């Protein structure tokens, strides 16, 4: 019928808090990698695809980039799943649990979420 693994990748409370002064399109693990000096690779100039996790409002570049780090993200050993992650591109969800593309409507939390954060990025 629909995925069932919402509430595991999707938690309202704390997405209200990540999304406040959060950065926009730009996954924040690719940032706080302190590693390195670039963190972005001016002479290369990348845009990769940002893919937020809607479970926690973590935002990690997709497939089209070099670290994938929304993958790393679930590739995460942790409790909590984090499996559910929105791309601000096509704004399709994806579950990494389900491995697609997840789909939603207006009464499910997850179509709200994704319209809210939408809301937010807008
Ligand atoms: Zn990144
Ligand atoms: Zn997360
Ligand atoms: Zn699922």
Same mark, same amino acid.
């Given at each position: ?8 990748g #999707?938690?309202?409370?704390?997405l ?7 950065? !926009? ?26 893919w ?22 679930? #590739?995460?050993?942790? =409790? ?9 591109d096509? !704004?399709?969800?994806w ?10 409507? =207006?009464?499910?939390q997850?179509?709200?979420?994704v ?8």
């Amino acid at each position: 019928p629909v995925c069932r693994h919402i509430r595991k990748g #999707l938690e309202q409370g704390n997405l209200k808090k990540a999304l406040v002064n959060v950065e !926009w399109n730009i996954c924040q693990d690719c940032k706080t990698d302190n590693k390195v000096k670039d963190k972005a690779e001016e002479e290369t100039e990348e845009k990769p695809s940002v893919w937020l996790c809607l479970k926690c409002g973590h935002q990690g570049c997709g497939r089209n980039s070099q670290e994938q780090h929304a993958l790393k993200h679930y #590739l995460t050993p942790r =409790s909590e799943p984090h499996c559910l992650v929105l791309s601000l591109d096509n !704004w399709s969800v994806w579950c990494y649990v389900c491995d697609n593309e997840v789909q939603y409507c =207006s009464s499910n939390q997850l179509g709200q979420v994704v319209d809210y954060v939408r809301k937010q990025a807008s």
